Design a binder for this molecule. Structure first.
Ligand code: FMN
Ligand code: FMN
Ligand code: 07V
Ligand code: 07V
Ligand code: CL
Ligand code: CL
Ligand code: MG
Ligand code: MG
Ligand code: NA
Ligand code: NA
Ligand code: NA
Ligand code: NA
Lengths: 399, 399
């Protein structure tokens, strides 16, 4: 059914429907599909779903000129630890990814692979089964008690990366980016948000290191920036974006409670602008808003009111994608897109509305999502959400 | 005469006219007199003007419950270098300061001494005459060619402070703060803005040090924070504020051209909030706006549009005084004071309007200022600007 008490607004008269260039891609509108893990990849081998993934992305590519950022994709086995999320390191994976990218391009849309590395959010028992470490910035602070205990039970205690291991991850990011482009992707997004490994280095709660990768703002940012630089060198700045969540608390990040958190992210943004001014500007910076500090809480919950991401705009002068509880708040989007380099990522409601862009332009009701099937090995709740027309035929305008 | 094409707005219906507590002081309104050097102190000995300074401050204290921050006052001879700016280190000075503070208090207003240290903005020949160093963070970058040359001619080349010399300045800040309170001041403001010594340490252009006082955000902030902590210990956090100008370029600071500038100031703000949360919250943070990157340029000139100070509010949670081209822009003030912890500093138009607060409340014309007498050894352009009533009697409503 449609979301009951939602009062839609047509946004066609706003910059949301003005074209913009992101990297090499001429977007026809500024509604972006942010990365959304759906757990349909198949084990063994973290293979994108052979039955349904092409259709899922095809559906969500239907509005011409849409920018799609994929679900997080593991850069290597060591970077993973969820059996049903996909990777981008193997031939068997890239066969499937190639079909997905081709399908998106057939719809005249674009696709950017999010490159993911889990760190302490991984399941240590899966990693132990596969002969892999359970990795983070540090070895003396843990995501939660349960993860610490699972790690010990699996004889795979949380391990603080060595410099050589950080370098190995960087090699893997490079090769994953190369794989992504060669298979036809338009670009990649470096996931440095939501409490995964790079975020674990950025945040002083999770990073208690005393080497060059911790203990100061510049040190905590080092790994993220080394990945940025390695990928810019490998595939070009115009094919690389970066995702950050300054106020996030998901996966035990500090958020606004850490008084140094704005400075930490301001430093990253400044370093990106420095590179841009020296001739290597990233295609975009993607920010999760303080509107959603934990994306598994219902919209309106976990909102941090004590901070704004607006500071980033004083520093970074390129495109900015903002995500977090925007589908239910067209009144907020209307104001945000007055800024001419702002794009809006719509996550959960792109799960439930394959034709979300039409609905945004035209001010149509939205399909309610089913959170129970966000993660599920099923076509149901993945490829069977209807378009607006299909929903009318099902009687949802009367339900 | 009155400013010709100014369209005043009565601001009495805004928070500008709501009381607020700053430190120990119950302000009756939120129009603050920011620090304004006037160069009426007499040589030798940097003595506040024995003829006119009491009257100047009395005039500008006339609206009950006004917060006044003094002209910058040198903490020691070594901190100075302008013969006609006052100090707060000697008995002869404090005799005059005591009269000024008493007069302000008689008007039911409040007074905060700005503690000033010039660094590279000092005149090296004055310092040489008095057997003093010409000091800055570094010795290999200079304010301008003229200052570098004056220093060499005076056989007083720019000197990069040693750790012991930084410690000596800190002792002097402590004693100057003590002197200020003992003489009756309500508090002090640490000047870390406008390109003077502390700002010279904050800014990576002027600070090329490779010891613990330079070469990173935390290192560049070290001296400013050591002064904050020393004064909090000596006289209490409720008697201490800090002034910053993130986007300033006056005195050869970097401003927004430095991509790391927001992070540098975000770090300072975070460190202040950390101290506040641990029980020692400063009375206020005073920010110069990007509206005025150089206060000796006419209003509207030298405006930086590429940055906002709004980031500070995401970090520091105490009172914020904002200064810069607000007298001519009541429409901007009206929006800024909707934030309930925002005060507005009015500088140049408080020079020319002793009764500025009445004029702001009531939406009255403003006296034009005479920049030629901003710095001058004269009562003229200091204590002979009329109140609104006096101006009407002079015929200014017809002139
Ligand atoms: C089921 C689900 C999966 C997600 N997967 C990812 C992911 O793989 N990578 C990522 O950076 N964010 C991921 N997110 C966070 C979203 O991209 C987005 O930032 C968040 O849901 C807030 O936007 P929204 O309110 O429009 O959903 C996910 C969120 C959800 C609900
Ligand atoms: C003549 C003059 C003297 C000033 N002296 C000081 C000073 O001693 N300390 C300081 O921090 N700022 C000083 N300033 C900067 C002002 O406090 C203020 O930030 C600036 O003038 C912008 O505010 P306005 O547009 O209301 O004048 C001075 C400015 C002027 C024009
Ligand atoms: C499996 C993934 C790479 C993650 C799933 C959920 C969130 C919120 C991510 O950011 C990535
Ligand atoms: C003599 C002073 C301490 C300075 C004069 C002019 C400005 C803009 C200051 O900030 C202080
Ligand atoms: Cl799993
Ligand atoms: Cl002089
Ligand atoms: Mg161990
Ligand atoms: Mg020398
Ligand atoms: Na789960
Ligand atoms: Na499920
Ligand atoms: Na002068
Ligand atoms: Na003069």
């Amino acid at each position: 059914s449609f979301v009951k008490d939602f009062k839609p607004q047509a946004l066609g008269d706003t910059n949301l429907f003005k074209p913009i260039k992101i990297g090499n891609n001429e977007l026809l509108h500024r509604a972006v599909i942010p990365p959304l893990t759906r757990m349909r990849a198949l084990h063994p081998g973290n293979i994108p779903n052979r039955d349904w993934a092409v259709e899922y992305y095809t559906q969500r590519a239907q509005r011409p000129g849409t920018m799609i950022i994929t679900e997080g994709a593991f850069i290597s086995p060591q970077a993973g630890g969820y059996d049903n999320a996909p990777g981008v390191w193997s031939e068997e994976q890239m066969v499937e990814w190639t079909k997905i990218f081709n399908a998106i391009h057939e719809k005249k849309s674009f696709v950017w692979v999010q490159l993911a590395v889990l760190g302490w959010a991984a399941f240590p028992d899966n990693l132990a089964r596969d002969g892999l470490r359970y990795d983070s910035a540090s070895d003396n602070v843990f995501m939660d008690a349960e993860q610490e205990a699972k790690a010990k039970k699996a004889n795979n205690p949380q391990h603080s990366l060595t410099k050589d291991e950080i370098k190995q991850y960087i090699k893997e990011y490079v090769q994953a980016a190369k794989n992504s482009i060669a298979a036809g992707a338009d670009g990649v997004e470096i996931h440095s948000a939501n409490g995964y490994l790079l975020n674990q280095f950025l945040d002083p709660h999770s990073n208690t290191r005393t080497d060059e990768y911790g203990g100061s703002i510049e040190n905590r940012a080092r790994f993220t920036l080394e990945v940025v630089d390695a990928l810019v060198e490998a595939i070009g700045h115009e094919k690389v974006g970066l995702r950050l969540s300054p106020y996030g608390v998901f996966n035990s990040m500090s958020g606004g409670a850490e008084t140094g958190i704005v400075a930490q992210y301001a430093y990253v943004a400044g370093e990106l602008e420095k590179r841009a001014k020296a001739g290597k500007r990233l295609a975009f910076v993607h920010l999760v808003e303080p509107r959603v500090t934990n994306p598994f809480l219902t919209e309106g919950e976990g909102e941090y009111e004590g901070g704004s991401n607006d500071f980033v705009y004083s520093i970074w002068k390129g495109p900015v994608i903002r995500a977090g509880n925007f589908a239910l708040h067209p009144e907020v989007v209307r104001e945000e897109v007055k800024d001419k380099r702002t794009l809006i990522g719509y996550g959960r409601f792109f799960i439930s509305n394959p034709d979300l862009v039409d609905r945004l332009e035209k001010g149509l009701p939205l399909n309610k999502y089913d959170r129970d099937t966000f993660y599920q090995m099923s076509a149901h709740g993945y490829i069977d959400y209807p378009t607006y027309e299909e929903a009318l035929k099902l009687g949802w305008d009367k339900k």
